[PDB]
């Protein structure tokens, strides 16, 4: 019912922060901020009409089912996560932190075929790394024989690098060990801004 | 001036039940309806109901009838919150909430304008399980004078957190620990890999020191490429 | 030309000086006798907005069936605040009276003669009247007792179903007789007779009527999730005497969906230590009195509460409501507001 957009929201101090939220339903629309450790706060509520201590800097807008949360000129009270609200339901939430720019960075991709280890248990784990890249917004998707994979992978995202600024993210392909003999190629896939195209580094299971 | 003042976190094993209270005051108790919202990081808030002071009548959401009861206590006034057979998943800060409009005549419940405290609530088994090491080999390529990538997987743990080092501390140049995340199983696992120059990789042994002390347990695991 | 407007508003009844009845007495000093021959002007090409729900002509009832009780229906000890007040509490004639509330000099009242108007919104056929009709003030939870039925067809009302938050009434547009009783010769308890046959095709009814608000959703009704008992019983006062009688059986959905077609008996008793819907706080009462106590009224409304949460059933579940006297009398001034002339 209600659909909240973007799920992380990594910008500078100074910058604007633009949060959507779609709803299924017309009715009043809230915005709440919660920052780390403490109570959520409300915003905005009647869908502009701003709470009482909320700078002018935040400015709700409604276009269609589309409501969104402005946040003009970041600063450090600003960053923490937000929610919209109908009634008794809540968006996902968008998570605003704070982002510290440098030069675009292209990610080293690798790629770790399971352990003969962990065979041994039943379940095989298939290990993808993007190395200290910039910005964070990164894809990847796992490919198996030339096929999407989905619901079977998690991915763990490191906070940014004080020396470079960058990112590192890791991917995590879960199969059993039936299920992983059946198959040749796995390959994962890494979109990013500092590479010209998509990038897949992959291997084929029992040659070296 | 209104104020939600909520009562002490806590721990509980799965199975147990929870209460909780929130003393109100600034305002005419029975005015106005009392809410509960949980926080639970990563998922979206859950509203668990409201209960007005009047009659102490409840509304409970639909996924939780039958679990949760709301009362109140006209003297002190403070509500109170019970939540039964309690799991992981229950795991959340709890909030006691109030609408911004509320008077005598009329009321908006759910612009929640105020908040309490917070309650956190930890639901986790008391029951620890050590973790899996498996090496993450480096892979037979990345060229010759550049530079190669090893790590060690570490799966299946209970409960958070594990913290791994490599060569005893020794190395720390191009080290990354990735967050843990929670698998389906319930367990925990996360990933420490490291980049290294790949022309030691026949001279310079590298061992991940992992360590989990709910369970009591270092282990060291020795990550050298394959030999085939 | 006039404007939505808020006064002092007189009340007007049949009160009888010869009579030692609680609501005559206080309507014998608080109203004016009625008129024999009322005026009702039918305005033509004039289309008004109300809004049952923000009705201030509640906002006087109220205050006036509170001072009623409250020089009335004095208890033998009032527990309020931590103070404990002992006053007299003698047995005394209790039947409710229809009561009249007009406006003065300057003021009218506008009436909505829509059949199928649900509360709130623009109204086609409005008159104009000096003063409301009959309404007995009534006090009571979950269901709505000898008060006015609708028209046509039984209209759902709510100042927003999609706020769960919000309390909804049922206007029935046909009547089911409830036969409470007390019999003389455990002291404290009663029951209620309802015609399953004709409660059960009325709840039918209403189900029917709520798949047209709710996307033709399975209705499903349930017991009270949990509260004081005025609230998660039928709380009326019957001759002076406080009673609570549980209605799960009157919500039963295997009803409406062979068996049920009979007599229904609703387990009830009679309290001396009651809430007080005042908001005052407990109030206690003299023992009942002997004899035979009954009360035959008219179930004409239901007071109901959605069920709510981030869910995704195909299923709506609804629960008998009340508490908020206010919305009691919503229910019989829902038609009406109050305008000033120029
Ligand atoms: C008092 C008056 O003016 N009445 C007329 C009514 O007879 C007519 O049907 C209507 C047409 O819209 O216009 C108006
Ligand atoms: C119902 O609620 C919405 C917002 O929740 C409000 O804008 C609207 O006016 C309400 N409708 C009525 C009839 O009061
Ligand atoms: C309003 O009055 C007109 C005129 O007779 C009638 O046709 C119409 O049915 C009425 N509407 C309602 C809702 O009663
Ligand atoms: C009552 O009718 C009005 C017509 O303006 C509509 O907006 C409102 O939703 C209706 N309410 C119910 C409870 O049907
Ligand atoms: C009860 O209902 C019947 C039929 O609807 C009606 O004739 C009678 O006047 C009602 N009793 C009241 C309003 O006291
Ligand atoms: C009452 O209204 C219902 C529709 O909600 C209708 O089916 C029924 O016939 C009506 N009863 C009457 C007019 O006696
Ligand atoms: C109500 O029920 C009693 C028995 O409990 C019966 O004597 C009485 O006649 C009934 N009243 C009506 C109006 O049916
Ligand atoms: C209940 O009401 C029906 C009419 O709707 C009537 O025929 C029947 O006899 C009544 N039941 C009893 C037990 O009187
Ligand atoms: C009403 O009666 C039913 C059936 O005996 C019982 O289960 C329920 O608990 C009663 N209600 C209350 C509030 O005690
Ligand atoms: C509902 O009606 C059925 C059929 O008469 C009966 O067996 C059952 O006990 C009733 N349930 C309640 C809660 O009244
Ligand atoms: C409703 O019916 C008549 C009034 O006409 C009366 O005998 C009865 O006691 C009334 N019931 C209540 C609860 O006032």
């Not at chain 1, 790629?111 to 190395?131: H, M, R, W, Y």
């Not at chain 2, 004078?145 to 957190?161: I, N, S």
């Not at chain 3, 205050?63 to 006053?87: A, H, M, R």
Request: charged share 20%; glycine share 8%; with cysteine.
């Amino acid at each position: 019912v209600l659909t909240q957009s973007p799920g992380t929201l990594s910008l500078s101090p100074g910058e604007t922060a633009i949060i959507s939220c779609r709803t299924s339903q017309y009715g009043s629309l809230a915005w709440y901020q919660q920052r780390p450790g403490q109570a959520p706060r409300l915003v905005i509520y009647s869908g502009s009409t701003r709470a009482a201590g909320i700078p002018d800097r935040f400015s709700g807008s409604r276009w269609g089912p589309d409501y969104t949360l402005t946040i003009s000129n970041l600063e450090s009270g600003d960053f923490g996560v937000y929610y919209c609200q109908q009634y008794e339901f809540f968006g996902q939430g968008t998570k605003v932190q704070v982002d510290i720019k440098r030069t675009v960075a292209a990610p080293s991709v690798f790629i770790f075929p399971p352990s003969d280890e962990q065979l041994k248990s039943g379940t095989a784990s298939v290990v993808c790394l993007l190395n200290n890249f910039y910005p964070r917004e990164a894809k990847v998707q796992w490919k198996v024989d030339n096929a999407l994979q989905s619901g079977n992978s998690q991915e763990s995202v490191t906070e940014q690098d004080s020396k470079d600024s960058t990112y590192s993210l890791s991917s995590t392909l879960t199969l059993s060990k039936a299920d992983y003999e059946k198959h040749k190629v796995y390959a994962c896939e890494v979109t990013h801004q500092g590479l010209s195209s998509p990038v897949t580094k992959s291997f084929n299971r029992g040659e070296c | 001036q209104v104020r939600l003042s909520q009562s002490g976190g806590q721990m509980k094993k799965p199975g147990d039940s929870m209460r909780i209270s929130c003393r109100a005051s600034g305002y005419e108790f029975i005015n106005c309806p009392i809410n509960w919202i949980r926080l639970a990081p990563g998922k979206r808030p859950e509203w668990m109901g409201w209960m007005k002071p009047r009659f102490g009548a409840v509304s409970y959401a639909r996924q939780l009838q039958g679990r949760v009861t709301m009362t109140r206590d006209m003297y002190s006034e403070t509500a109170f919150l019970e939540l039964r057979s309690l799991t992981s998943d229950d795991t959340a800060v709890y909030f006691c909430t109030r609408g911004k409009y509320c008077t005598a005549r009329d009321y908006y419940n759910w612009d929640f304008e105020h908040w309490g405290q917070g309650t956190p609530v930890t639901v986790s088994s008391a029951s620890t399980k050590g973790p899996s090491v498996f090496p993450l080999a480096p892979s037979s390529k990345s060229t010759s004078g550049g530079t190669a990538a090893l790590g060690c997987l570490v799966k299946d743990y209970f409960p958070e957190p594990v913290t791994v080092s490599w060569n005893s501390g020794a190395l720390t140049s191009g080290v990354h620990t990735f967050p843990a995340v929670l698998q389906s199983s319930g367990l925990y696992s996360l990933s420490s890999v490291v980049t290294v120059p790949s022309s030691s990789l026949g001279t310079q042994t590298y061992i991940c020191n992992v360590n989990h002390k709910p369970s009591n347990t270092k282990v060291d695991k020795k990550v050298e490429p394959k030999s085939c | 030309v006039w404007k939505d407007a808020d006064t002092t508003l007189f009340c007007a009844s049949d009160a009888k000086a010869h009579e030692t009845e609680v609501h005559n007495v206080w309507a014998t000093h608080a109203c004016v006798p009625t008129d024999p021959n009322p005026q009702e002007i039918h305005l033509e090409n004039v289309t008004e907005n109300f809004n049952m729900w923000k009705n201030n002509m509640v906002e006087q009832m109220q205050e006036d069936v509170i001072s009623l009780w409250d020089q009335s229906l004095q208890p033998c000890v009032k527990l309020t605040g931590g103070s404990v007040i002992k006053q007299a509490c003698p047995k005394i004639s209790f039947d409710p009276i229809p009561i009249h509330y007009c406006t003065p000099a300057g003021y009218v009242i506008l009436k909505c003669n829509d059949k199928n108007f649900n509360g709130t919104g623009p109204c086609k056929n409005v008159s104009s009247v000096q003063c409301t009709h009959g309404i007995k003030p009534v006090v009571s939870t979950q269901l709505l007792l000898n008060g006015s039925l609708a028209e046509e067809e039984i209209i759902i009302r709510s100042e927003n179903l999609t706020n769960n938050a919000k309390t909804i009434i049922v206007h029935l547009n046909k009547s089911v007789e409830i036969n409470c009783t007390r019999p003389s010769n455990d002291i404290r308890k009663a029951y209620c007779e309802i015609n399953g046959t004709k409660w059960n095709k009325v709840l039918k009814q209403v189900t029917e009527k709520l798949k047209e608000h709710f996307n033709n959703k399975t209705i499903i009704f349930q017991p009270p999730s949990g509260g004081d008992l005025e609230i998660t019983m039928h709380h009326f006062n019957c001759r002076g005497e406080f009673f609570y009688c549980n209605t799960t059986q009157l919500f039963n959905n295997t009803c409406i969906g062979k068996g049920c077609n009979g007599t229904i008996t609703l387990p009830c008793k009679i309290k001396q230590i009651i809430n007080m819907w005042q908001g005052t706080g407990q109030a206690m009462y003299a023992p009942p009195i002997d004899g035979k106590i009954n009360c035959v009224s008219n179930i004409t409304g239901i007071l109901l509460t959605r069920d709510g949460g981030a869910n995704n059933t195909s299923n709506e579940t609804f629960r008998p409501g009340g508490g908020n006297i206010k919305d009691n009398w919503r229910s019989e001034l829902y038609k009406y507001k109050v305008v000033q002339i120029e």
